[PDB]
Design a protein around this ligand. Structure first.
Ligand SMILES: CC1(C)S[C@H]([C@H](NC(=O)[C@H](N)c2ccccc2)C(=O)O)N[C@H]1C(=O)O
Ligand SMILES: CC1(C)S[C@H]([C@H](NC(=O)[C@H](N)c2ccccc2)C(=O)O)N[C@H]1C(=O)O
Ligand SMILES: [Cl-]
Ligand SMILES: [Zn+2]
Ligand SMILES: [Zn+2]
Ligand SMILES: [Zn+2]
Ligand SMILES: [Zn+2]
Lengths: 243, 243
């Protein structure tokens, strides 16, 4: 009873934990997926997924929820279920699904990180910029000095795709990588919103993500349930059709 | 060059005809799918599909476009490219994607038909009601006296599903059946907007549609490309998980 059934996004499944207006799903002993819903009048809810990672003695969050209130709820769930400090949050680009609740993280005193470009785009996108800017080498790997204390979070800029600023994250010592809005599931009919997409480079960016995290057998993404690596292949092949 | 790439909906394929803001795809010698697009700010375009059917010296339309202007463009295209008059339109329920262009039909002097219930709901939905009401037998088939001169349009009310009023249409003399917004594609991760849905009866209504048109191999639907019968059965499996 009382199930959120989104118009866009995966439906609730056995194992999912309802907490307020959000859903949490444990993916590994120290990794959970957060799911928040934006209700659009006349259309219904759009689900958006991120990650919560317990690494040693702290929690690391990948992506905010759509709103400040939802993101405050994520922090309350973390406090309740895990009860370790949230050391940092990383956001995967400057769109509402990934960065809409930044004020809730800052209110909580949590150090926030995004691609420098995401921070530069934030004002234009109506997002609040993160505190800190990540920069990247020519091979796409984050410059370690800009990602202090990230631990198992390996951050990779795969090239422009869904947006110019999109980044991805692998979780060292797990079989999980996070593709955000760049990677769609292996059964997806479309690449979602292409309004900011780099149609020429998307395919290579998708394949670069797969090459960056060869250990990841569980691919987590923003608007589908976790999938196999066929998500990457299928995303790239869809993207091949754009060029 | 200059393709519409919707966020929700089929992509452009070889053979598609771009005409202003619309796309037409021939599905059979005497059947075309019309596609119109609604821009959702921040989300991108949402495709909606209906049908154009040639029956001898006249054309029959299933569903309006999202808007009056788009719907006027469909009528221009029928007039200019098919060169036959529209005898009537049948609209498949009282939402914008299916009925948002009613006034353009009426201004063109075209007789319109909808489920009586659709006409009753239309003003509550800000839609213009069709000029004529269809009624249905206890087994779902349209009452012939309410659908005069429908030629090959075989109208079936499958039961409440996507909405209480949703209707479906088979094309006699073809292997095509139209499920409107009731049926989702064979690989859909969701049933779309369930806000007005009858979650108890959806699965049986989807199966009723399949059973009404048991030989139809091409299943046309509102927001994806024409699919196999697995669209019907997958839709019913997804609906089974609502109950
Ligand atoms: C799910 C989307 C089609 S919408 C989302 C993003 N858009 C937003 O966060 C918008 N603020 C939004 C507006 C209206 C409804 C939903 C989202 C984008 O444009 O990439 N990510 C897209 C995607 O991941 O393909
Ligand atoms: C594509 C949709 C998810 S939206 C559409 C319909 N919604 C409308 O026509 C609304 N007027 C609308 C409002 C905002 C944005 C888009 C559509 C509905 O509620 O069934 N059909 C839905 C569906 O077929 O599942
Ligand atoms: Cl319920
Ligand atoms: Zn985005
Ligand atoms: Zn997204
Ligand atoms: Zn509808
Ligand atoms: Zn629809």
């Amino acid at each position: 009873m009382g199930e959120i059934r989104p118009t866009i996004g995966q439906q609730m499944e056995t194992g999912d934990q309802r907490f307020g207006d959000l859903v949490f799903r444990q993916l590994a002993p120290n990794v959970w997926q957060h799911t928040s819903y934006l209700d659009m009048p006349g259309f219904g809810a759009v689900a958006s997924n991120g990650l919560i990672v317990r690494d040693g003695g702290r929690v690391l969050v990948v992506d905010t929820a759509w709103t400040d209130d939802q993101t405050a709820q994520i922090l309350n769930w973390i406090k309740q279920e895990i009860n370790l400090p949230v050391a940092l949050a990383v956001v995967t680009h400057a769109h509402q699904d990934k960065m809409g609740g930044m004020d809730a993280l800052h209110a909580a005193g949590i150090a926030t990180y995004a691609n420098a470009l995401s921070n530069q785009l934030a004002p234009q996108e109506g997002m609040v910029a993160a505190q800190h800017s990540l920069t990247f080498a020519a091979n796409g790997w984050v410059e370690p000095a800009t990602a202090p204390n990230f631990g198992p979070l390996k951050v990779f800029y795969p090239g422009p795709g869904h947006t110019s600023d999109n980044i991805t994250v692998g979780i060292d010592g797990t079989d999980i990588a996070f593709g955000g809005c760049l990677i769609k599931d292996s059964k997806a009919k479309s690449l979602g919103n292409l309004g900011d997409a780099d149609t020429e480079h998307y395919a290579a960016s998708a394949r670069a993500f797969g090459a960056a995290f060869p250990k990841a057998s569980m691919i987590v993404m923003s608007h589908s349930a976790p999938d196999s690596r066929a998500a990457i292949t299928h995303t790239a092949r869809m993207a091949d059709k754009l060029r």
